[PDB]
């Protein structure tokens, strides 16, 4: 967990969306989803709302369209939930209501609720929701226009992750169904990566071979995650 | 494509997925797309072609691997399954409660001559007791979803991934591709046509079989003469690789 707002909004600019993705994680315990997508106008506005941040976004939005949906469930939650926030701030910015909810005291859940109530007067609720769908209009098309070159590199770096995250999620629900409390370690030891270091993949075949330890299915699996300690581990009773 | 229904659920008592998975498309040229419709010449489909107990339990493999969280099959894949799912509860409806009869015949028949013939015996179940019944069954469904053999799901998922996973990179290649900014880059044009077509050939594809294996190595050869760029290299990496690990971890296996 970080510290600040401040230091996601970081994350986001610093193309670490893996990280990014852990913002509304973070306002859980610093503070329904009606309050949640609120609480992230509130600080996103008072954090530095920018052009730069929505298009920074354009490319993890269109990361996450992608037919081989890399981000996927509370990852998905994440990333949608911030996204219906971004159109209300994207209304506010353009419109000229950003100040309202800019401050300098520390609130409270409760109290940030209030000001974001009062502040609805600013703003008639048939227009509210007709600047909602231009700047909806206005985002996408930044989705659109998305360097390629920035949402390809992004997906790897996310995917590579990712997609270990799922085949080994899956191995565990089909081996509970089928050593179990082993790889739940390994399931919440790669939840915390935002990324793959070549020295966390190191800690991944300390996991592998690990299991060995303790059925023909789980074979392809761990082809899958680690190879080489396999070819060695065969190798090692050939030569009995 | 197959000629047969029967060849279809063939293929799904085998264990050919992506290919039992072709029958949707097959039922709608044989016959000529409303959901109901579909679903409609589902049920009477495969109850002439001689539905039962082994065929749901298959099916429920299938399912099953349709819940991974690696999500092997996406988009029309999905839809295909689900939708035959849709037609899955009323036959299961129909064989415990004897009313197959009334939809079995060899007489070859159209769209609109099934539509008619599941109309009238629409009359044979009152709507209460089939909603009563179309539950009992999908729980019976799901129940043997959850007891699916781990190891026959397992080895559904890798060869079905096996396919599939390249299907959805591609697409993903073909739309950055389109979106990619390239003034100077007049390969681009024929480049995105190749991805297109490698798409294409890639569609009807149920296994990855030497042939595929060599079809696709064409596409991407031929996509490296063209010059692309830095992000695209990525993709071509990927879709025709060189494992000589997985090679050599086969073959120990």
């Given at each position: 967990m970080l510290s600040s707002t401040k230091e996601y909004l970081q994350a986001l600019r610093d193309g670490k969306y893996l990280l990014f993705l852990q913002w509304p994680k973070f306002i859980a315990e610093y503070?329904?989803?009606?309050?949640m997508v609120s609480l992230l106008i509130f600080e996103w506005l008072n954090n530095g709302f920018c052009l730069d941040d929505i298009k920074k976004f354009a490319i993890l939005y269109a990361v996450h369209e992608?037919?081989?949906?890399?981000?996927?469930?509370g990852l998905s939650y994440a990333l949608t939930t911030i996204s219906i926030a971004l159109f209300p701030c994207m209304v506010y910015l353009t419109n000229n209501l950003q100040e309202h909810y800019i401050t300098s005291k520390k609130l409270s859940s409760k109290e940030v609720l209030q000001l974001m109530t009062m502040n609805?007067?600013?703003?008639?609720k048939q227009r509210f929701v007709e600047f909602l769908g231009q700047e909806q209009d206005k985002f996408f098309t930044w989705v659109k226009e998305a360097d390629s070159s920035a949402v390809s590199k992004a997906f790897d770096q996310i995917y590579s992750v990712t997609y270990l995250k799922y085949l080994i999620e899956d191995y565990l629900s089909l081996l509970e169904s089928a050593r179990i409390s082993l790889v739940v370690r390994l399931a919440k030891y790669l939840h915390e990566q935002t990324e793959l270091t070549q020295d966390v993949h190191d800690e991944i075949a300390v996991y592998v071979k690990k299991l060995?330890?303790?059925?023909?299915?789980e074979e392809e699996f761990l082809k899958k995650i680690s190879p080489l300690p396999f070819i060695d581990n065969t190798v090692r009773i050939l030569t009995g």
């Open positions: 503070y329904e989803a009606d309050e992608m037919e081989s949906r890399p981000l996927r469930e609805n007067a600013y703003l008639e060995w330890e303790m059925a023909e299915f």
